[PDB]
Coordinates of C-alpha atoms and ligand atoms in Angstrom, one line a residue:
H4 CA 102.8 103.1 123.5
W5 CA 99.0 102.7 123.2
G6 CA 97.4 99.4 122.4
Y7 CA 94.8 96.9 123.5
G8 CA 96.5 95.2 126.4
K9 CA 95.7 95.5 130.2
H10 CA 98.3 98.1 130.6
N11 CA 97.9 100.3 127.5
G12 CA 94.3 99.6 126.3
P13 CA 91.3 101.9 125.7
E14 CA 90.9 102.8 129.4
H15 CA 94.4 104.3 129.5
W16 CA 94.3 106.2 126.2
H17 CA 93.0 109.4 127.8
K18 CA 96.3 110.0 129.5
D19 CA 98.0 110.7 126.2
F20 CA 94.9 111.6 124.2
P21 CA 92.6 113.6 126.4
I22 CA 90.1 113.9 123.6
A23 CA 89.3 110.3 124.5
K24 CA 86.8 111.8 127.0
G25 CA 85.4 114.2 124.4
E26 CA 82.0 115.1 123.3
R27 CA 81.9 113.1 120.0
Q28 CA 83.8 109.9 120.6
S29 CA 83.4 106.6 118.7
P30 CA 82.3 103.9 118.7
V31 CA 78.9 104.1 120.2
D32 CA 76.0 101.7 120.8
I33 CA 73.3 102.1 118.2
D34 CA 69.9 101.9 120.0
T35 CA 67.8 101.0 117.0
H36 CA 64.5 102.0 118.7
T37 CA 65.8 105.6 119.5
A38 CA 67.6 106.3 116.2
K39 CA 65.6 108.7 114.2
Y40 CA 64.6 108.0 110.6
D41 CA 65.6 111.1 108.6
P42 CA 63.7 111.2 105.2
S43 CA 65.9 114.0 103.9
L44 CA 69.0 111.7 104.1
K45 CA 70.1 110.9 100.5
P46 CA 71.1 107.3 99.3
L47 CA 74.7 106.6 99.7
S48 CA 76.8 106.7 96.5
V49 CA 79.7 104.3 96.7
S50 CA 81.8 104.6 93.6
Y51 CA 84.6 102.0 93.7
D52 CA 84.7 100.9 90.1
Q53 CA 88.1 102.6 89.5
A54 CA 89.7 101.8 92.8
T55 CA 93.4 101.1 92.9
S56 CA 94.6 99.1 95.8
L57 CA 98.4 99.3 96.4
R58 CA 99.5 97.5 99.5
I59 CA 98.6 95.8 102.7
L60 CA 100.4 96.8 105.9
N61 CA 100.5 95.3 109.5
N62 CA 100.8 98.6 111.6
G63 CA 100.9 96.8 115.0
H64 CA 97.2 97.4 115.7
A65 CA 95.4 96.2 112.6
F66 CA 96.3 95.6 109.0
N67 CA 95.4 98.3 106.4
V68 CA 94.7 97.8 102.7
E69 CA 95.8 101.1 101.2
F70 CA 94.6 102.8 98.0
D71 CA 95.7 105.4 95.6
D72 CA 94.0 108.5 96.8
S73 CA 95.8 111.0 94.5
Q74 CA 92.8 111.1 92.2
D75 CA 89.1 110.6 92.5
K76 CA 89.2 106.9 92.0
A77 CA 87.2 105.3 94.7
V78 CA 84.8 107.8 96.4
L79 CA 81.9 108.0 98.8
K80 CA 79.3 110.7 98.4
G81 CA 75.6 111.3 99.2
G82 CA 74.0 110.1 102.3
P83 CA 74.6 112.7 105.0
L84 CA 77.8 113.9 103.2
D85 CA 78.4 117.2 101.4
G86 CA 81.2 116.8 98.9
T87 CA 83.4 114.0 97.8
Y88 CA 85.3 111.7 100.1
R89 CA 88.2 109.6 98.7
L90 CA 89.0 106.1 99.9
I91 CA 92.5 105.9 101.5
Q92 CA 92.4 102.6 103.3
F93 CA 90.3 99.9 104.9
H94 CA 91.0 97.8 107.9
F95 CA 89.2 95.6 110.4
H96 CA 88.7 95.2 114.2
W97 CA 88.0 91.7 115.5
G98 CA 87.8 89.5 118.6
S99 CA 89.5 86.6 120.2
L100 CA 86.0 84.8 120.1
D101 CA 83.1 85.1 117.6
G102 CA 80.9 86.9 120.2
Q103 CA 83.0 90.1 120.3
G104 CA 85.1 92.1 118.0
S105 CA 83.0 94.9 116.6
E106 CA 83.4 98.5 117.9
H107 CA 79.9 99.7 117.2
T108 CA 77.1 97.7 118.8
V109 CA 73.4 97.4 117.8
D110 CA 71.2 97.2 120.8
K111 CA 74.2 96.1 122.7
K112 CA 74.9 93.3 120.3
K113 CA 78.6 92.7 119.4
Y114 CA 79.6 91.3 116.0
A115 CA 82.7 89.1 115.3
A116 CA 84.4 92.0 113.5
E117 CA 83.9 95.3 111.9
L118 CA 85.2 96.7 108.6
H119 CA 86.1 100.4 108.3
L120 CA 86.5 102.0 104.9
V121 CA 88.2 105.3 105.6
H122 CA 87.6 108.2 103.3
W123 CA 88.7 111.9 103.4
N124 CA 87.1 115.1 102.2
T125 CA 88.7 116.2 99.0
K126 CA 88.2 119.9 100.0
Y127 CA 91.0 119.5 102.5
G128 CA 93.6 118.3 99.9
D129 CA 95.2 115.5 102.0
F130 CA 94.3 113.1 104.8
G131 CA 96.5 114.8 107.4
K132 CA 94.7 118.0 106.9
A133 CA 91.3 116.4 106.8
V134 CA 91.7 114.7 110.2
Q135 CA 91.9 118.2 111.7
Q136 CA 88.4 119.2 110.4
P137 CA 85.0 118.3 111.9
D138 CA 83.9 117.0 108.6
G139 CA 87.2 115.7 107.4
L140 CA 86.5 111.9 107.2
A141 CA 83.7 109.7 106.3
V142 CA 84.0 106.1 107.6
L143 CA 81.7 103.3 106.2
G144 CA 81.4 100.7 109.0
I145 CA 80.3 97.2 108.1
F146 CA 79.7 94.5 110.6
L147 CA 81.0 90.9 110.1
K148 CA 79.2 87.8 111.4
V149 CA 80.5 84.3 111.3
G150 CA 78.6 82.0 108.9
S151 CA 79.3 81.4 105.2
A152 CA 82.6 82.4 103.7
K153 CA 83.0 85.8 101.9
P154 CA 84.7 85.1 98.6
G155 CA 85.6 88.7 98.2
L156 CA 87.5 88.6 101.4
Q157 CA 89.7 85.7 100.6
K158 CA 92.4 87.5 98.7
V159 CA 93.0 89.4 102.0
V160 CA 93.0 86.3 104.1
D161 CA 95.6 84.7 101.8
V162 CA 98.1 87.4 102.0
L163 CA 98.1 87.7 105.8
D164 CA 100.9 85.1 106.1
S165 CA 103.1 87.6 104.5
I166 CA 102.4 90.4 107.0
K167 CA 102.3 88.5 110.2
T168 CA 104.1 91.0 112.3
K169 CA 104.3 94.8 112.9
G170 CA 105.9 96.7 110.1
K171 CA 105.5 94.2 107.4
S172 CA 103.9 95.2 104.1
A173 CA 103.1 93.4 100.9
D174 CA 102.1 94.5 97.4
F175 CA 98.3 94.3 97.1
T176 CA 97.2 95.4 93.8
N177 CA 93.9 94.9 91.9
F178 CA 91.7 94.3 95.0
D179 CA 88.1 95.3 94.5
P180 CA 86.5 96.6 97.7
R181 CA 83.1 96.2 96.2
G182 CA 83.4 92.5 97.1
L183 CA 83.1 93.5 100.8
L184 CA 79.8 95.4 100.6
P185 CA 76.4 93.9 101.7
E186 CA 73.5 93.9 99.3
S187 CA 71.8 96.8 101.1
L188 CA 73.2 100.2 101.7
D189 CA 70.7 101.2 104.5
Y190 CA 72.7 102.9 107.2
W191 CA 72.8 104.7 110.5
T192 CA 74.8 108.0 110.8
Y193 CA 76.2 110.1 113.5
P194 CA 79.1 112.5 114.1
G195 CA 82.1 110.9 115.8
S196 CA 85.8 110.2 115.9
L197 CA 88.7 108.0 115.0
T198 CA 88.5 104.9 117.2
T199 CA 92.2 104.7 117.6
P200 CA 94.6 107.4 118.9
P201 CA 94.7 110.3 118.1
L202 CA 90.9 109.9 118.4
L203 CA 90.3 113.0 116.5
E204 CA 86.6 114.1 116.2
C205 CA 86.7 114.4 112.5
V206 CA 84.4 111.5 111.3
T207 CA 81.0 111.3 109.8
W208 CA 80.2 107.7 110.7
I209 CA 78.0 105.7 108.2
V210 CA 77.2 102.3 109.7
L211 CA 75.5 99.8 107.5
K212 CA 72.5 97.9 108.9
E213 CA 73.2 94.7 107.0
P214 CA 76.3 92.6 108.2
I215 CA 78.5 90.6 105.8
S216 CA 79.2 86.9 106.7
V217 CA 82.7 85.5 106.7
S218 CA 83.7 81.9 107.6
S219 CA 85.2 80.6 110.8
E220 CA 88.3 79.8 108.8
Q221 CA 88.6 83.4 107.5
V222 CA 88.3 85.1 111.0
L223 CA 90.7 82.5 112.4
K224 CA 93.3 83.8 110.0
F225 CA 92.9 87.4 111.3
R226 CA 93.6 86.0 114.8
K227 CA 97.0 84.5 113.7
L228 CA 98.4 87.9 113.0
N229 CA 100.8 89.5 115.6
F230 CA 100.7 92.9 117.3
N231 CA 104.5 92.6 117.7
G232 CA 107.5 92.9 115.4
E233 CA 109.4 89.9 114.0
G234 CA 111.7 88.6 116.8
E235 CA 109.8 90.3 119.5
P236 CA 107.6 88.1 122.0
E237 CA 104.5 86.8 120.1
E238 CA 101.3 88.5 121.1
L239 CA 98.3 87.5 118.9
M240 CA 96.5 90.4 117.2
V241 CA 93.0 89.9 118.7
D242 CA 90.6 92.1 120.5
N243 CA 91.8 95.2 118.7
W244 CA 88.4 97.0 119.4
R245 CA 87.6 100.1 121.4
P246 CA 84.3 99.6 123.4
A247 CA 81.2 101.8 123.0
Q248 CA 81.6 105.4 124.2
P249 CA 78.9 107.7 125.6
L250 CA 76.5 109.2 123.0
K251 CA 76.5 112.5 124.9
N252 CA 74.7 115.2 122.9
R253 CA 74.2 113.2 119.8
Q254 CA 71.3 111.8 117.9
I255 CA 71.8 108.8 115.6
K256 CA 69.9 109.1 112.3
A257 CA 68.7 106.2 110.1
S258 CA 68.3 106.1 106.3
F259 CA 65.5 103.6 106.6
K260 CA 62.3 102.9 108.5
Ligands
ZN301 ZN1 88.8 101.3 112.5

């Protein structure tokens, strides 16, 4: 019964998921001055031209746009990664106000929201096996600021009315995730975890330096979603973010000077 409320939020998760207090938890604050430039880091290869979106789902903590990951259709490679990671889903974390919502922070600065494009390492055969491995997942994190609209986001915003409550899904074919990427692929990278239970320490995080901008109307639509099921008391889906966790024995690396 975990969530983001006063009684079941991030500070409680450790009781069911003791790894919450582990050595490689996410998100973290990215201290830009102490991140180390690593000239051996390769450019990222984001290959989304053949992506096949299938569906959008309200799972009670966020909404997931899911992809066909039964073939190498939309993959991430390069950067800090060895091998090929397949896109399975993306989702967002966002705030009740424009000054909070991101999970990662940059020099303690919070963004309005954060996009997570979740990929799994094909050497493990499926997502459920991958999350059990220290190099199982690669998550591309992209910050959202409020400003101009993002045209490439609008098709997501428009279907949200159909998935207002927990457990609702809708067909969501022919969505191109390239429309959510900033111009630059400069990034920070560190080893971490899923930011929701089960909090498994299986993620190579790749956090892009450059945010995307979305409009006030687009983020407002995110905030009209519900954490609850239809016919249950209405609780707006807002502030579905975990705060920064201790860095512990980790160094954040930068692809750029
Ligand atoms: Zn996430």
